[PDB]
Paper text:
Myxovirus resistance (Mx) proteins are key mediators of interferon-induced innate immune response in vertebrates. MxA restricts a broad range of RNA viruses, including the influenza virus, whereas MxB was recently shown to inhibit human immune deficiency viruses.
The overall folding and domain distribution of MxAMO1 shows a high consistency with MxAFL. Altogether, the MxAMO1 structure indicates that disruption of the oligomerization interfaces of the stalk does not affect the architecture of MxA. To explain this result, we reviewed the crystal structure of MxAMO1 at the corresponding region. Hinge 1 is substantially attached to the proximal end of the stalk via a hydrophobic network which allows very limited relative movement. On the other side, salt bridge pairs involving D363-R640 and E632-K644 from BSE and hinge 1 may act as a key bracket that supports the BSE from hinge 1 while allowing a certain level of elasticity. Thus, mutation of the central R640 would engender the collapse of this bracket, hence the structural defects of MxA. Sites 352 and 500 span 35.3 and 35.6 Å in crystal structures of apo MxAMO2 and MxAFL, respectively.
Numbering used by the authors: 48 to 93, 104 to 114, 116 to 118, 123 to 133, 136 to 149, 159 to 183, 194 to 436, 451 to 530, ...
């Protein structure tokens, strides 16, 4: 309760988690000449977002990005150095008088469009308490500070007001200031406080900061309007310090369960989104082999589905096997047309008044040779298209795997298609082997059937079965050649990087859980 509640969040902040996760905080809103700079001086005792981690010392540190310096006089120079070097700068101070309190200071309001958005970036989170610093003589209605605070915190339930430099309050309107601090104008759950600090003329001398601590108490003890606010514990820096730490702790404690609820669901969101980008490539050579082999197996199964007309397809389209059945139907029609036209051609020679007629049927049969070979070509093209479309679906992220697959797909096409043409072509050399009209016409039906049957079977044999077979064999052999694993498993840098960032994000999220679970 004492100090740990604060130690908790700040280390979660040091985790770099704050980008994935909202951490309980007091954000310090600065105005134009609000003198906020001086108020922090009062608490600390000594621009892109500054984190003030304050710890009060018996026994008796600055970090820009990764690096740090150690000592209290030198602090001023280290600050301005780090800046020149929107990223968090943390400052940890420890002395007997400094409060136990962590604040985050933002650039004061005034390329301005950007500062609002930076400020809004912190303020809009219901886990942020907006700590508004405005000079007390100016109307609070006009101040940009409150307006921002109000834009984000409509009900004033996460905002705290600091009125500054109560000297320059126009005489006659002291009671208006008192109504604001007493909460009578714009109502804040967490309230108002008023403080007096280092003005223009003392910052030039820079007389001692602890002497100023005694300069407040006599300003408020003697002031006729504000003496009443001190009796009510709403005036001075030491009072301000106590209230802030009281309020911070109350916030952190209130916030915890809704936060442990928030980390879980974020963890999920990252892990769900992490799924879409595959998995890591194993360091171990053997695990590498199993990884590649599994990838080969799924390619090889998608190829298999094609071979069997089993592959999963769209509602309108049809399976490759079926598309080849339609080619094969077109082919039968070609046989049918060839058969009858040969019938017409033969009657035009027999009643034109033996082996002259044998030759004529033979020529009618040979004419089918090119339809057959075209069909060979037409079908390999379909399968090649199919096989490469599988290689796309499986190996896009692994371009060498895809490159290699394509290469085999092409190499085995050239080989199988050659073999298929050979057998088709040779089939039409093997073929040279009114009672005459019939004998020839019956001979003609036999030959066609032979041809109508074998040609598709050869096409199917070489360009679908043997083709798929060999390719699968070829791919499966990649797993034997270990010194190519490094090349084959090279993957796209785009998704390779996307995964890398998420794993890092998820890592920091996991540490967070760990430290949060440790605390109770």
């Amino acid at each position: 309760k004492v100090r740990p509640c604060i130690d908790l969040i700040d280390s979660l902040r040091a985790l770099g988690v704050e980008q994935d996760l909202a951490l309980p905080a007091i954000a310090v809103i600065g105005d134009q000449s609000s003198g906020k700079s001086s108020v922090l001086e009062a608490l600390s005792g000594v621009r892109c977002p500054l984190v003030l981690k304050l710890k009060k010392l018996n026994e008796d540190k600055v970090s820009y990005q990764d690096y740090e310096i150690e000592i209290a006089s030198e602090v001023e120079k280290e600050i301005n150095k780090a800046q020149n070097a929107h990223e968090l700068i943390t400052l940890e101070i420890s002395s007997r008088d400094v409060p136990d309190l962590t604040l985050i200071d933002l650039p004061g309001i005034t390329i301005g469009y950007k500062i609002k958005t930076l400020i809004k970036k912190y303020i809009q989170r219901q886990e942020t308490i907006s700590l508004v610093v405005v000079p007390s003589n100016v109307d609070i209605a006009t101040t940009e500070a409150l307006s921002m605070a109000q834009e984000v915190d409509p009900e004033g339930d996460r905002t705290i007001g600091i009125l500054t430099k109560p000297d320059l309050v126009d005489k006659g309107t002291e009671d208006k200031v008192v109504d604001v601090v007493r909460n009578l104008v714009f109502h804040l759950k967490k309230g108002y406080m008023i403080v007096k600090c280092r003005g223009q003329q003392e910052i030039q001398d820079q007389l001692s900061l602890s002497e100023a601590l005694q300069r407040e108490k006599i300003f408020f003890e003697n002031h006729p309007y504000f003496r009443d606010l001190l009796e009510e514990g709403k005036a001075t820096v030491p009072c301000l310090a106590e209230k802030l730490t009281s309020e911070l702790i109350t916030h952190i404690c209130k916030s915890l369960p809704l936060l442990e609820n928030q980390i879980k669901e974020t963890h999920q969101r990252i892990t769900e989104e992490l799924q879409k980008y595959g998995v890591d490539i194993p360091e171990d050579e053997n695990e590498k082999m199993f990884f590649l082999s599994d990838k080969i197996n799924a390619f090889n199964q998608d190829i298999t589905a094609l071979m069997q007309g089993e592959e999963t397809v769209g509602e309108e389209d049809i399976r490759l096997f079926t598309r080849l059945r339609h080619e094969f139907h077109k082919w039968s029609t070609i046989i049918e047309n060839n058969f009858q036209e040969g019938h017409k051609i033969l009657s035009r020679k027999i009643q034109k008044f033996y082996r002259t007629f044998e030759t004529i049927v033979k020529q009618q049969i040979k004419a089918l040779e090119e339809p057959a070979v075209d069909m060979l070509h037409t079908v390999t093209d379909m399968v090649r298209l199919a096989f490469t479309d599988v290689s796309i679906k499986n190996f896009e992220e692994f371009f060498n795997l895809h490159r290699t697959a394509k290469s085999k797909i092409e190499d085995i096409r050239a080989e199988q298609e050659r073999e298929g043409e050979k057998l088709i072509r040779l089939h039409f050399q093997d073929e040279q082997i009114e009672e005459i009209f019939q004998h020839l016409m019956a001979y003609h039906q036999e030959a066609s059937k032979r041809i109508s049957s074998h040609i598709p079977l050869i096409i199917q044999f070489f360009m679908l079965q043997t083709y798929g077979q060999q390719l699968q064999s070829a791919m499966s052999q990649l797993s034997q050649d270990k010194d190519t694993y490094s090349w084959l498993l090279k993957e796209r840098s785009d998704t390779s990087d996307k995964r890398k960032f998420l794993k890092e994000r998820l890592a920091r999220l996991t540490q967070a859980r760990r430290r949060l679970a440790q605390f109770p």
